[PDB]
């Protein structure tokens with residue numbers, strides 16, 4: 001890819017400025033894995049991820065990348081195994097995460113239904129490619145669907161991804177998005193489909209998967225509220241959009257509801273998901 005040299009990265013991220021971008025700093029975000037900073041490497045704006053158990057998820061991401069190169073996956077430009085810390089250099093996504101755009105973080109406009117259908121279709125192509133190449137993401141969520149200049153969906157965080165049903169003791173991912181069997185230890189591509197279903201619900205509603213001050217706290221519980229005839233998806237539609245037509249909204253929910261099949265084998269495969277998502281627009 002490119003070994004970069006820790007000192008070039010330290011330099012281009014203003015000595016890894018802890019100050020947020022908001023105040024003119026370099027810190028973009030965090031996560032248990034490490035801090036992500038904005039850098040400037042030869043006119044190119046980059047995203048530099050500086051990393052409980054000490055070099056795992058590093059060589060994992062490096063291996064999953066190189067293997068995986070699709071227009072719906074974030075591209076890794078380099079790494080840095082020298083100096084003082086383990087860094088990874090990805091392409092800077094100017095339109096941040098889908099979670100950010102759905103929540104209108106930092107006064108951005110609300111995504112239209114048109115944009116949301118491109119984002120769903122695109123993210124499905126990315127999962128498709130990953131599954132075609134026998135990889136299971138294990139953390140499909142809206143925070144992990146990044147958006148470029150043209151609002152193309154790019155799937156991120158492959159440090160947990162596994163080559164493909166096997167059970168495990170170290171259970172990882174984001175609950176609220178996690179499939180019931182994934183919460184039990186089952187490593188399966190079917191879990192990725194379930195987690196995508198939660199993302200479609202987030203796209204439709206504009207509601208985050210989990211909200212402690214909301215009833216229900218878990219967004220997947222609204223699927224039960226809808227199915228138990230109490231309400232309709234039309235009552236949950238993101239009011240922050242002028243172009244969401246009930247016919248395609250119901251079509252997305254139909255897909256989301258199929259993904260959110262509690263029984264792993266009853267869920268559609270990513271290819272079925274892609275063709276139903278294509279159908280919705282065409």
Ligand SMILES: NC(=O)c1cnc(Nc2ccc3c(c2)CC(=O)N3)cc1NCc1ccccc1
Pocket residue numbers: 028029030036047049074090091092093094095096097146156157
């Ligand atoms: N506009 C933005 O805020 C923004 C710009 N560029 C990004 N690049 C990027 C690409 C691949 C990967 C990562 C970041 C982290 C990783 O693991 N892979 C991510 C962004 N937001 C989401 C974001 C995610 C994590 C931390 C801070 C921020």
